[PDB]
Write a protein that binds this ligand. Structure first.
Ligand SMILES: Nc1ncnc2c1ncn2[C@@H]1O[C@H](COP(=O)(O)OP(=O)(O)OP(=O)(O)O)[C@@H](O)[C@H]1O
Ligand SMILES: Nc1ncnc2c1ncn2[C@@H]1O[C@H](COP(=O)(O)OP(=O)(O)OP(=O)(O)O)[C@@H](O)[C@H]1O
Ligand SMILES: O=c1ccn([C@@H]2O[C@H](COP(=O)(O)O)[C@@H](O)[C@H]2O)c(=O)[nH]1
Ligand SMILES: O=c1ccn([C@@H]2O[C@H](COP(=O)(O)O)[C@@H](O)[C@H]2O)c(=O)[nH]1
Ligand SMILES: [Mg+2]
Ligand SMILES: [Mg+2]
Lengths: 465, 465
C-alpha cells in the first residue's frame, strides 16, 4: 500500500456535501487540513494552483519506477555500464528531503541545523563514530550549495534511489577502486560530484528531451490519480474568489494532463454539463520558471493555444478571456487579478520553489500538499506506543538508539519524511515555518466551510512561559 | 530605571555559593537561563566569549547618550545643520531590532515574515490604512538588504533614535520640501538612503576615528557595569574546560576594558591574589571581524602586546602561553583548542554576527545575552493581566487594537523587543531559532551546577499532535 493507493481510494469517492457529513469527514486525520499559522479563509480572494504533484498526483511506485527506468536508459546510452540495466526501483529505500553530499557520496538525513540524523553510503548505513571521520562535528554547512544538494520533491525520488544504487555498484565492483571523493577506473577518475551531475542531467533530459512525458500521457490511468471532486472544489472556489494555475510545465503537457483530470461525463456535480478544464481558471500561466517567478521572473509571453507555440514578442495586453500566458512573474498575477499577496492562497508541493519562496518573497498565504502524509499518518498512529515509549525514556541510552531505529524502519530504510525518532528533519522544520496550511491533498479544503478560521495557537518564548 | 540599573544591582552583589542558595536564586526570572534547545552542560569543553555588550555591558542611557552626542557632532562637522545640536537622546523611543527602510524613511517593527507590526516616519506613527500606501501588502522583502537595514545591537540604539529625529527635523522644517524618497532643499536632493548612509558612516567614524573610545575609558565607572562575580565564573569555567575571548574590538581597547572589569583587590573569590585578565583565557583573539570570522575569516596575525601593534606577517606558530591573536577564523579556535563546534558554547550579544552565524556556519552551541531582558521581564509580569486579557479576546476587534497599543507603550514608543501584542517580532523569532540558551546576563550560568542539563520540550508538528 502506497500513499497513492490511499489518495486514489479517497478519490474513488463521491462528495457528500451535507454540512454534518462534511464536519464528520474532516475529523479523520487523513481528510484534515493542518494549521501552522492562523488563516481566515474569508480573506482569501485568489486560490492559486500548481499542477504537477498538486492537481496531478502521479501514482506510486509506477511513475517513480518509470522515471527511474528511463534515467538509467539515458545514462547507459551516454556511456554508463550496462549493469545499471539490472537496477529496478525500490520504493522502500528513498525518503524525500535527503541531502546528497557530492564530496563523499553519501545520502544524509539532517535536521534544520545541518545535524546528521542518518548517513548512507550506497546501501550501507553509517552509524555513530564511523561517520565522525567525514563529519567530525556531525554537521553540514547548508550554505555550501555547491556540495550539498537537497532532494525536495517527489520528482527526485527516483534519483535518490539511483545515487544509492550507483555508489553501491561502483563500490562493490572490482573494476573500480574506491577513493574518498569518487572512483578510479584505470586512468579515468569519476568523482561523486560528476556522477551526481550526470544523474541530474539525465533526469532533466528524461523530463525534457526523453519520453517520460509521451509515456505518461499514453497511459494516464496507470500514472495519474483522477478525482471527481476536483471540479467541484474548483467551482466552489470560483464562487467566492479568483482561481489561477501557475505551472513550470509547458502548455501542451498541461493541456493533456488537465484535460484528463477533468474527464468525467459531468462538470462540478454529477448531472451537470461537462466543461473544459480552462473555464475553471481566471488566469492560466505556463513555463512559470519557479522559483525565479517569485523574483524578477522572465518576459510575459502569450500562448497560441492552437499550435501550442508561443506568440513572438512580449505580451503587453490585458487579461482577456481564453488567454494563456507563459513566463512572467508573481507580480503579473497580482497585477492581472488585482490581488495583494495576503489575498492569495497558493497551493503547491515544492517546499522550496512553491511555498518558501512565495511566502518570503511576496508574503502570499501558502498551502503545502504532502502526498506521503496519507501513509505517514497511518503509521504515526499504529506505532504511537513506539513513539510514546521513546518519549518516555527521554524523561526517564543504548535503548534510545535501538528504539529510534525500529520506529523509523516502519517508514522505510531512510525513515520518516518528518523525523528520526525525537529529532525533526529539515523538511519538517521548513513545513512548520513556511506552510501556513498543509495536508495529504488539497481536496481536504472541500470538507471545510467557505469562511472557516484555521487556528494555530500563539507561540510563547521560554521567558514568556 | 534602566536594564543597566537592574544589571548593576545584581552586579553589586557577592556570590553565595551554597548549593541551596544557588538553586533558590535561579528561581527568579532575572537570574534564570532560558532554554530554546536542550543543552547538556557536561558536553561543553570550551566557553567562548565576546566582550562588548557581553563581558563589558555599557551603562544605559549614559553610553547611548554619549554615542548619540558624538555622531550628531560628526554629522554637524561634516555639514549637517546646526539644529541637530539641540537633539538629545531619548531612551524611551528606540527599541532594538527595528528595520530602517531607506526608500521611504520609515522605522519598521516587523515579524519573522516581514509583516508590519509598527511603522514610524520620524515620530509620527503610521496606523492601519495610511501605511498600505507605501506597503500595499503590509510586508517587506527581508531579502532586499539594499533597502532595509536591521538595527541588531545595543550599538544601534543611538542611530535608531537619530534617524527618527532627522526625519522629524527635515519634515517639520520649512527650508526643506518633503518628497516620497527624501528631501529637497533648493537644488540639493537628500534621499533617506544617503541620509542613512551619512548616519551609518558617522557612527562608524565615532567608534573608529572619533573619541567615543577615549571618552569611555576615561570614565569607566560611568560607562561600564563591573561585577565581582565575573572572575569567579571564568575561573569556574576554566576548571572544567577551555575559555576564550573573540572580539571584533582591537587589543588596546580590549586591554583597557578587560583590565577594568577585573579590577578588584582579589582574584576569583575575596581573599585571593588578583590576577590579570589574560590569565583567565586559554586563547585571546582580537579584530575577529565577525561574521566574516565564521566563514573564510582573515589572515591570522599575532599581537605585539607591548606596543599594541600587529607583528608583520601571518602567524604560523602554535598556541603558546601569552600569545594574542588578531583576525583568523573560527577554524583557528577549533584547531588551537582542539574542539568541535558542539564542544563550544559561545556567549555573545549580536543575534546575527555572534549567534546566527556561529550556529549555521559551524554548529557551535550558542548563548545569547539580552541585557534589556532585565527590564522586559519586570514589565512582562506586572502587565500579565493586560496580556492574559488580550490572550482572552483572541479566544472570544477594535478592543484588540486598543489593548495591544497600551500593552506595548509600557516598554516604550516602539514597544517590546520581543512582540507587538500577540505577534512576535523578527528578533524574538531569531532568538528562538538560533540561541540555544539566552538570559539577561551570562553571569546567570553561575547559579547552575557544573553538569546541568538545560531541557527544552520536544516539538511536534500539528498532524503529530
Ligand atoms: N529546501 C531547499 N532546497 C533548495 N535550496 C534551499 C532549501 N532551503 C534553503 N535553500 C537555500 O540554500 C541556501 C543555503 O542554506 P541556508 O541554511 O543559508 O538557508 P536558510 O533557509 O536561511 O536556513 P534556515 O532554515 O536556518 O533559515 C540558501 O540560499 C537557502 O535559501
Ligand atoms: N538580523 C539580521 N541582521 C542582518 N542581516 C540578516 C539578519 N537576519 C538575516 N539576515 C540576512 O539578510 C538576508 C535577507 O533575508 P532572508 O529573509 O533571506 O534571511 P533568512 O534568515 O533566511 O530568513 P528566515 O528567518 O525566513 O530564514 C539574508 O542574507 C540573511 O541571512
Ligand atoms: O528534474 C526535474 C526536471 C524537470 N521537472 C519538471 O518540472 C515541472 C513541474 O511543474 P509544476 O509542479 O510547477 O506544475 C514538470 O513538467 C517536470 O517535468 C522536474 O520537476 N524535475
Ligand atoms: O557601528 C558600529 C561600529 C563599530 N562597532 C564596534 O564593534 C566592536 C564590537 O566588539 P565585540 O562585540 O565583537 O567584542 C566595538 O569595538 C565597536 O566599536 C560597532 O559595534 N558598531
Ligand atoms: Mg508541482
Ligand atoms: Mg559584542
Amino acid at each position: 500500500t502506497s500513499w497513492s493507493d490511499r489518495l486514489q481510494n479517497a478519490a474513488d469517492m463521491p462528495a457528500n456535501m451535507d454540512k454534518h457529513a462534511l464536519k464528520k469527514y474532516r475529523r479523520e486525520a487523513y481528510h484534515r487540513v493542518f494549521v501552522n499559522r492562523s488563516l481566515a479563509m474569508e480573506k482569501i480572494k485568489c486560490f492559486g494552483f500548481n499542477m504537477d504533484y498538486t492537481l496531478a498526483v502521479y501514482k506510486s511506485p509506477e511513475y517513480e519506477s518509470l522515471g527511474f527506468e528511463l534515467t538509467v536508459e539515458r545514462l547507459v546510452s551516454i556511456g554508463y555500464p550496462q549493469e545499471l540495466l539490472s537496477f529496478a526501483y525500490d520504493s522502500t529505500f528513498p525518503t524525500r528531503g535527503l541531502v546528497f553530499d557530492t564530496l563523499y557520496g553519501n545520502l544524509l538525513k539532517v535536521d534544520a541545523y545541518g545535524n546528521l540524523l542518518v548517513c548512507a553510503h550506497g546501501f550501507n548505513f553509517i552509524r555513530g563514530p564511523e561517520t565522525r571521520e567525514q563529519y567530525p562535528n556531525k554537521f553540514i554547512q547548508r550554505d555550501d550549495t555547491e556540495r550539498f544538494y537537497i532532494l525536495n520533491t517527489l520528482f527526485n525520488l527516483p534519483e535518490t534511489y539511483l545515487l544509492a544504487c550507483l555508489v553501491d555498484f561502483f563500490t562493490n565492483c572490482p573494476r573500480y577502486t574506491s577513493c574518498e571523493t569518487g572512483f578510479k577506473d584505470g586512468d579515468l577518475f569519476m568523482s561523486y560530484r560528476s556522477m551526481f551531475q550526470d544523474v541530474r542531467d539525465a533526469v532533466d533530459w528524461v523530463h525534457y528531451k526523453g519520453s517520460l512525458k509521451e509515456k505518461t500521457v499514453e497511459n494516464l490511468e496507470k500514472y495519474v490519480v483522477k478525482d471527481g471532486k476536483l471540479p467541484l472544489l474548483l467551482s466552489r472556489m470560483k464562487e467566492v474568489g479568483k482561481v489561477f494555475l501557475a505551472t513550470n510545465s509547458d502548455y501542451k503537457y498541461t493541456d493533456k494532463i488537465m484535460t484528463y483530470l477533468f474527464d468525467f461525463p459531468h462538470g462540478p456535480k454529477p448531472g451537470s454539463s461537462h466543461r473544459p478544464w480552462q473555464s475553471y481558471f481566471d488566469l492560466i500561466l505556463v513555463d512559470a520558471r519557479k522559483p525565479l517567478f517569485f523574483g524578477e521572473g522572465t518576459v510575459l509571453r502569450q500562448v497560441d493555444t492552437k499550435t501550442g507555440k508561443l506568440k513572438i514578442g512580449t505580451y503587453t495586453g490585458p487579461l482577456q478571456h481564453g488567454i494563456v500566458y507563459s513566463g512572467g512573474s508573481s507580480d503579473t498575477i497580482c497585477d492581472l487579478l488585482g490581488a495583494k499577496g495576503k489575498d492569495i492562497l497558493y497551493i503547491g508541493d515544492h517546499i522550496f520553489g512553491d511555498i518558501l519562496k512565495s511566502k518570503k518573497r511576496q508574503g502570499w498565504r501558502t498551502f503545502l500538499v504532502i502526498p506521503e502524509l496519507a501513509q505517514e499518518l497511518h503509521v504515526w498512529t499504529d506505532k504511537s506506543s513506539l513513539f510514546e515509549e521513546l518519549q518516555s525514556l527521554d524523561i526517564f541510552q543504548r535503548r534510545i538508539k535501538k528504539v529510534t531505529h525500529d520506529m523509523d524502519m516502519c517508514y522505510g530504510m531512510m525513515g520518516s519524511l518528518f523525523r528520526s525518532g525525537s529529532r525533526q528533519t529539515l523538511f519538517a522544520s521548513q513545513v512548520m515555518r513556511y506552510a501556513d496550511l498543509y495536508a495529504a491533498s488539497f481536496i481536504n479544503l472541500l470538507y471545510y466551510p467557505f469562511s472557516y478560521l484555521f487556528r494555530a495557537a500563539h507561540v510563547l518564548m521560554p521567558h514568556e512561559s
